[model samples]
Target: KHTTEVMITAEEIDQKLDILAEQINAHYADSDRLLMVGLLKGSVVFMADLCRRIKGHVEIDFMSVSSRDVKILKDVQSEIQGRDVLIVEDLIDSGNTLNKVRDMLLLREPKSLALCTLLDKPERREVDVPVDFIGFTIPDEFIVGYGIDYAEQYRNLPYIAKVV
Candidate 1:
């Protein structure tokens, strides 16, 4: 039993992505190239928007996975060694999945690894994850749209909404 309302407009989303991209670009400016890795499904839209705004040699990669021990479904094809890598996500809540992703990526021994997300729900975090670029800090709510979803719907919505 739930109804949803807009929490952040599409305009706001664009503005935030611009800001996030700027920060990310500045952070990686000195690196020879920037490898942006998006967590599949949820990160696709947001990653595309933000990655387009970045100024650099940007290479995009995607990873699909399972939760138990976070096994890889579709592994990242990019060579992770000796490069600046950025993990992009649509939202971060429990931090478990992202944390596991980080663990795996780190083992590949990239020169550096950072996390970026369109939204962060700190209130729901189980473990601390250092998100290098954050678009918005939202509360613990069931958010949908803008690549974040309830079930598999709302990933096509332009703005973010909360179900109550």
Candidate 2:
């Protein structure tokens, strides 16, 4: 099969974020204790834009976790206890990091937990995990854009496009 580059244009990203904002606003319209927990570095851009446009009062916290690192779950070990947590991620591949983070967060006693992922490649998942607010379901491929990256590069591209 011939593989083609898939891209999400700048305009499309903006429009989709607007729709996401509206949907999330409606979900937490009158909630005073909603907390948005962004999964650091990668999710910063999306989290910033999302929080800025939210229609209701909500609190935000930042937690950085890296499965490839030695600390593993140490960074996010606390702060999720009894929280209405919303975990924002740039993408989900292999399901390794997400599964580790999710399982650890669950032990923290969150009142409620939801996932907001920009991209999903279910075919690559080795562990089963449910995604709550999925921005899009993408076919299994190596994508880079809208803050997604390869070896931490390409995050600055205005749109999602395959590396040539």
Candidate 3:
């Protein structure tokens, strides 16, 4: 049962995505092909919107990594060497798992590797990870909506909100 009110409206998210798209465009302006890799499940909605908003040539891939083992389930089909790679994630919490995944992607030898996340909780970070683009910096709270889930529900919500 959802009992919380909207904390981030859909309009706010849309505005941020527009800003994020510009940042990405600036960074990859010289690159001919840009590969946008999305972290699975939670990132689907964000990835779809962000990719659509971005201008210029872009490719997309999806990866599902285990938080405990850092094992990746999905792999990029295109060769990564000398290509620009941007990882799109739903949220950044502890940072440990994401750092591990970044390390794994680095092994592929992409010309550049950067991270973009919809939400961030820097206070809970247990590891240092450079987030190149961030949509929202939220306090340490359980939030659900816009692809963020609570017990696998509320991901369908259009706006992000605190889980009360």
Candidate 4:
């Protein structure tokens, strides 16, 4: 009743990053050094690759937050005050966590804060979070790989796949 079907290949993802980073660069062209904060447990892999494409003084940091209320457990170390911040997320599902994180970051008063997500699950969204840059818009299905995974198993895979 279930099978894993390949959806997005690694090469395709690589190309998408090339495009996404270009937009990121132009949007923050005049801004100071960009600080990219990756949401924990989801965006680790994609952030690693996306930041490399950025051709400026880009600082990378990670944040770990709780599941339910999105409480911050481990926050970014880099300074956020008056800095340009870009939140890197792998998938936008439910939109609850990203919504809370955005509000939290906004409180810090960064010069500007933007969002870039690899996959946007609009069907599952509830809070209607603003995603500045999106790589792919996927259907309502369980996908894993390329930093997205199930039970921490398929994350090691390079290509994205769907459970069908």
Candidate 5:
């Protein structure tokens, strides 16, 4: 559907993560255990690295969700309650899914609720969705790498870059 290609070498992945880890380590220092919830599939790669770098005991959960017509977290379900919740999404390109997910989770009454995402496409945003912890802010380009997928391909690349 979208077209453009570029390459992301593996070395850059580690370097960017080093920067991301530093940010997480500073913010999560006081907690003994923090709940790290991954937004199902897209954020798996980032979730893995962030959990390792964050300096605290961290428990993890996964939420598998889908959205339609830019609203509603279709088939949304999770068993998160009374815990600090950090939903890791892949990208906030549409801003619709993340907003819906956040509202749904808030009803669960978590002690804290925030979002962490590997990429942010603010230029394409259609709503005011809040992201508490951000790894990187990228332009509105068709990108694939590090767990992003379309027709389920090209997610294994280490760093974020456009297709070459």
Candidate 6:
């Protein structure tokens, strides 16, 4: 009821993830261990699918935070010292939230850190955040599906679309 039109199909999303997985694998080929931290609520679905496609040694944890308040509802249990870090996020708009999160993670002294986002609205970005991998780039519009939601709805549609 809230969608204008389908912007990405489920099959297309899957295909892109497969390619991203390969890129991730190649990027981390030299590391013995990798830590994947998912930004929660919106990132759960993408995190789950992408992590499975990773070929090397990988461990995962999650953090739940809100952009408005910037409070951590949940935090990662894994020790961050001297490990490769990958931050998985569903979408990035102004990038304020992910920027805060990356700063927080950096304080832990991980060996290295990078970000991967399912969708990016580069035009709307307010901060210069380094994203190592991205699934799709779309116009700055309200989108929902494949783990993004509109008022806590439309997250299960399996594809990205702008809301009506």
Please report the candidate that would top TM-score against the real structure. Answer: 1
* Tens-digit lDDT string for candidate 6 (35-57): 99998789999998899999888
The positional error of residue 129 in candidate 4, measured at the CA in angstroms, is 1.1
Instruction: Give the residue spans of candidate 3 off by over 4 A.
Output: none
Per-residue alpha-carbon lDDT of candidate 3 for residues 1-164, written as tens digits (9 for 90 to 100): 64978899999999999999999998888889999998778999999999998878899998887744767677767788888999999899999978998888899899999999999999999988999999899899879988888888898898998877
What is the TM-score (0 to 1) of candidate 6?
0.94
Show where candidate 1 strays beyond 4 Å.
Answer: none
Per-candidate TM-scores read 0.96, 0.83, 0.95, 0.95, 0.82, 0.94
Cα lDDT for residue 121, candidate 3:
94
Cα lDDT listed for each candidate: 0.90, 0.73, 0.89, 0.90, 0.72, 0.90
lDDT of 4: 0.90
- Clashes, model 3: 0
Question: Worst 10-residue stretch by lDDT in candidate 5?
Answer: 67-76
lDDT of candidate 1 over 1-164, digit per residue (tens): 88889999999999998899889888987989999999889999998898899888989999998743878899988899999999999999999998988998899899999999888888899988888888899888878998887889898999999887
Candidate 1 overall Cα lDDT vs. reference?
Answer: 0.90
TM-score of 5: 0.82
What is the alpha-carbon RMSD of candidate 4 to the true structure? Answer: 1.6
C-alpha RMSD for every candidate: 1.3, 3.6, 1.5, 1.6, 3.2, 1.7
lDDT (tens digit, per residue) of candidate 4 on 86-135: 99999997989889989999999999999999999888988878899999
How high a TM-score does candidate 1 get? Answer: 0.96
